[PDB]
Design an enzyme around this catalytic site. Structure first.
Site, mmCIF file in Angstrom:
data_model
loop_
_atom_site.group_PDB
_atom_site.id
_atom_site.type_symbol
_atom_site.label_atom_id
_atom_site.label_comp_id
_atom_site.label_asym_id
_atom_site.label_seq_id
_atom_site.Cartn_x
_atom_site.Cartn_y
_atom_site.Cartn_z
ATOM 1 N N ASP A 323 -38.339 10.095 -17.135
ATOM 2 C CA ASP A 323 -39.067 9.029 -16.456
ATOM 3 C C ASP A 323 -38.944 9.179 -14.934
ATOM 4 O O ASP A 323 -37.878 9.517 -14.414
ATOM 5 C CB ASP A 323 -38.528 7.676 -16.927
ATOM 6 C CG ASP A 323 -39.130 6.491 -16.181
ATOM 7 O OD1 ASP A 323 -40.323 6.190 -16.391
ATOM 8 O OD2 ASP A 323 -38.392 5.827 -15.420
ATOM 9 N N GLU A 360 -42.466 13.163 -16.743
ATOM 10 C CA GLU A 360 -43.673 12.385 -16.534
ATOM 11 C C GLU A 360 -44.198 12.680 -15.134
ATOM 12 O O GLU A 360 -43.536 12.354 -14.146
ATOM 13 C CB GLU A 360 -43.352 10.898 -16.699
ATOM 14 C CG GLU A 360 -44.470 9.958 -16.338
ATOM 15 C CD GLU A 360 -43.972 8.548 -16.063
ATOM 16 O OE1 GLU A 360 -43.200 8.347 -15.093
ATOM 17 O OE2 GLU A 360 -44.343 7.638 -16.827
#
Lengths: 592, 592
Positions: A323, A360
């Protein structure tokens, strides 16, 4: 003049400790010489090529050279320098080039390939745990919110109110109990949104990296899910949130649950792990400062750092989705981001050689990928946003987008050009996720184009990922509305779309070219894209038409010079180099 | 539709802690909205722009936004997202883009700029010491060669025989004694080929990194040269050869001059600094293995490592030119090359904040530069080889080259696009050096184009470097023939060419735009390139024509909207947007 080359058999062939490279030419004025420009330890080499006596296909001349594999780094970059008496011309992943191509946009092949070779064989499914499924067996105060958490029933409409504190109650045993459905869908791999202890419903506000959150079923429910996936031959990836902690974490502790938190103690054992800074102004997510050597040891440097912890027994996860991978770094910003992402990946492979670490990236990830600090990226720039543009007329900002097939494929082929063939095959392709509107909603009036994206998702180089419920037609606007509870009532399911997903995973499972093949775009104009996957002697041909019905001519291509074409999906028809394409269709052919 | 933006005043303006960005548009269908896409800690931002009431030039609309400078890394990347009701369009360093540009090919400006700000003000001169000048005061066995060294007189023709062992006897006091000539030429900075103890004449086979070679005048002659350059306000750069040592170095010692050399002792204190490997098969240059932590400490990690040594008093050199910068690394190849080049640069700045560290890159250096592991590169890819192609029809391999002005400028502007404005200004531009044929020889029959390259060398963004004797018309084929002794007899000097160099350094010294300015190519077609340097209100216009005489129209450009044009060099004439260009000319105008 025409040229063809893909970084895969039949154009390359490893043999003893040599990498044989073959180039195809065709045309009226062929270069009498061709040089294989190939890199060895960043030094550019001019390797002679020699003409092959045997024409591989009608009207086509083959040139062949070799790269020596005993020296040089594993990534073998190369391009083709065509030479006449008075001029030269480069042949590249992006066609012909009148001036030398970028070193980092040549063909490239990793030999030896040390990456996670299993990724290319997978079909991924992303689950937001709270919203997928409740196990058969089946409130507190959220300090970062202003209220207690809300608990709704599975049929209650989603609302914008308290989106981060509303729990529909899905858990990990519910995933376990739904494994037969996922296997029927074709899933071989799961990527789970965060599962560690955290007060929010999405749980990116991590409070304890070492414990599964009770609301999802706790440690025992994650161990069970690890057992059951292993039993079903399935891979498991957890969400790795390391750019920032939660403000309820013991290290920070905004709400004084202890006495040594960094938020309210200048003497805290973790005072330097923070900045006195968060993730873009969000007070619940204080950013971690990787200038501190002890923080580095806690997240990845140490033997029982968090990254390694969930990779060794009994957890034995198959890797990490990172993330906010792009902002992680020192001093409150991204300083030394590349070094730290490499450290995370390096520690993961130390614990598990075939660990899959991908980040990501909503933006352009080529710098991270081109320096091997991670294996792959959620491919928004190379896959998702091109399709949002070409198919849905929109983008990350919901600014309108008017791009035709030429632009769409220039876009997609430009991005891949910066990536080796092995990297391209394990890029994490998807159409939407917890962070975006549902792709189905984004199509607006053109929702009928949705099957086109599904076919494309399974045939473009890279590993495909379904966001849970996409397969049965779930829609919704962005967060919180893209996290609807999954509809298990088949009466609220798009059964046709479900079957399209099922067959595409079957095609991909069936045909090596959809998993290991090179990719050559063959026609790209206005509404029509046509590309072929290519691997040894097999060819998979894919034709996408986003508009009214039309016919398209396909010039003779030595890539398409096969026995015949077996139609496997869609209603298109190919005969005598003529593609007959129905309005708003996608078709897939195998070669006989 | 038309657009203009350069990463410099008048388009940008730093004000308190904000970076104001202004974009110019002109045309029939202007976007009603424009977004400033700018990066902050790798996170892409969508910053609103607002229309300026006041038109900056006839028919031109200005948009203005701001980047917040208080956060984010020093490199501020940005581009312009033009928005209509139904579509978008990107404006980039490389014109308009229908799909999003590469993150690393946007405009960029380093604020704060921590680089060597003096480099842009310099004119560099490269000296091969043995061949430049003998001081007024003015043999052994070369073990890597097969014979004793040869000593020739200054007028003897150069030959291919024993090129690396023939000494014409130039030394460092000879440079000192020639400082008045170099100041007359306009030189402010010297880059010296290797001067440390080494048996060869070029001395890339380093035997002792700590001692100047007696043949050049020894330590005392280098100290004197440091004193004299400082006295004349001149910078000094030494050749840093760290990829490999010489085989006569005490660490390796092929010829048993000691008992502890790594070549013939498995127990050597330096056994691990080597591989049992060289620089591409050359036995005299064994490659150094940076896997060894003690080697890292000796070259750059330590306080008195070699890199830092020649930077602190009494030597106080201004930096390092890094020989074979791209192959330096671990285990016999380039493994971890980027990390080590950064280490070298980092250690240099530690000893001297404004140290200039740049690497010899015959290839594409953008990856090194885009990660700030060095300040600059010998700009063969971004400057030299484009000119070898456009002007001389050839390249690094002496393969023919047929490129027009469009291609030449696409080539040059493509490379710069990957570089911030501060990086572009300190790129090390030159036409040839010790490693290449003389550019004058490379022109063959088109030698009359040579003044064009000289003008271009001083006006294209970047710092220019003269290879010694280029200014007086020295020619010669590649090594050894590109190292002719300098002709001090003016009867053997091209006095006109000498005066062209002198005036160009005067123009550059005179006009800020030639040192700090942005650069916009304005016309590039067939034989004619036309670009303008741009800085605050001043404009320097440059027109190059490699062919027969011709006339060229120059559309109205708000960049060229000045009081008037003062011709400063060349015989071109500009009147009413008409360039009258004589055959094989280059012209420079200042704005009034």
């Amino acid at each position: 003049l025409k040229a063809w080359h893909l970084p895969v058999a039949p154009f390359i062939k490893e043999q003893q400790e040599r990498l044989m490279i073959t180039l195809w030419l065709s045309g009226d004025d062929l270069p009498p010489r061709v040089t294989l420009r190939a890199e060895e330890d960043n030094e550019e080499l001019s390797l002679p090529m020699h003409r092959l006596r045997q024409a591989p296909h009608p009207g086509v001349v083959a040139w062949r050279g070799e790269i020596n594999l005993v020296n040089g780094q594993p990534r073998r970059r190369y391009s083709f320098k065509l030479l006449w008496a008075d001029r030269q011309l480069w042949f590249t992943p992006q066609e012909f080039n009148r001036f030398p191509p970028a070193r980092l946009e040549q063909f490239a092949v990793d030999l030896p390939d040390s990456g996670p070779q299993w990724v290319a064989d997978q079909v991924f499914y992303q689950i937001f745990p709270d919203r997928f499924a409740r196990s058969q067996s089946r409130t507190y105060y959220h300090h970062a919110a202003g209220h207690d958490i809300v608990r709704k029933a599975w049929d209650e409409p989603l609302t914008a109110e308290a989106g981060g504190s509303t729990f529909y109650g899905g858990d990990l045993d519910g995933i376990s109990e739904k494994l037969p459905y996922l296997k029927q869908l074709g899933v071989t791999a799961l990527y789970l949104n965060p599962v560690f202890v955290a007060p929010s419903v999405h749980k990116y506000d991590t409070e304890d990296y070492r414990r599964v959150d009770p609301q999802f079923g706790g440690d025992a429910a994650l161990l069970r899910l690890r057992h059951n996936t292993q039993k079903e031959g399935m891979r498991l990836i957890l969400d790795g949130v390391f750019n920032h902690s939660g403000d309820s974490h013991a290290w920070f502790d905004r709400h004084q649950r202890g006495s040594g938190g960094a938020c309210h103690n200048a003497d805290s054992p973790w005072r330097d792990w923070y900045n006195f800074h968060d993730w873009l102004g969000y007070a619940s997510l204080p950013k971690l400062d990787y200038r501190s050597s002890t923080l580095i040891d806690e997240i990845y440097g140490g033997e029982d750092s968090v990254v390694r912890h969930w990779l060794k027994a009994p957890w034995s996860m198959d890797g990490w989705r990172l993330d906010v991978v792009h902002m992680l770094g020192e001093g409150g910003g991204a300083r030394n981001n590349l070094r730290h992402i490499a450290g995370i990946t390096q520690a993961a492979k130390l614990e598990r050689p075939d660990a899959f670490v991908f980040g990501e990236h909503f933006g352009d990830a080529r710098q991270w990928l081109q320096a091997d600090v991670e294996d792959s990226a959620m491919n928004y720039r190379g896959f998702t946003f091109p399709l949002w543009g070409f198919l849905a007329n929109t983008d990350i900002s919901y600014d309108p987008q008017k791009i035709d097939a030429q632009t769409c494929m220039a876009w997609m082929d430009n991005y891949r050009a910066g990536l080796s063939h092995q990297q391209q095959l394990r890029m994490f392709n998807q159409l939407d996720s917890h962070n975006t509107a549902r792709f189905k909603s984004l199509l607006g009036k053109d929702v009928a184009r949705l099957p086109l994206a599904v076919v494309w998702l399974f045939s473009w180089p890279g590993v495909p990922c379904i966001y849970y419920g996409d397969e049965v037609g779930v829609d919704g606007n962005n967060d919180p509305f893209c996290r609807k509870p999954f509809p298990w009532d088949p009466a609220l399911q798009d059964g046709d779309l479900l079957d399209l997903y099922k067959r595409m995973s079957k095609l991909r499972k069936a045909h090596q070219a959809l998993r290991y093949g090179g990719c050559q775009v063959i026609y790209a104009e206005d509404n029509v894209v046509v590309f072929v996957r290519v691997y040894k002697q097999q060819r998979v041909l894919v034709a996408i038409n986003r508009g009214e019905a039309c016919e398209v001519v396909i010039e003779d291509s030595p890539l398409l010079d096969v026995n015949g074409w077996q139609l496997k999906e869609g209603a298109g028809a190919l005969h005598d180099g003529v593609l007959t394409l129905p309005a708003i269709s996608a078709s897939v052919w195998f070669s006989r």
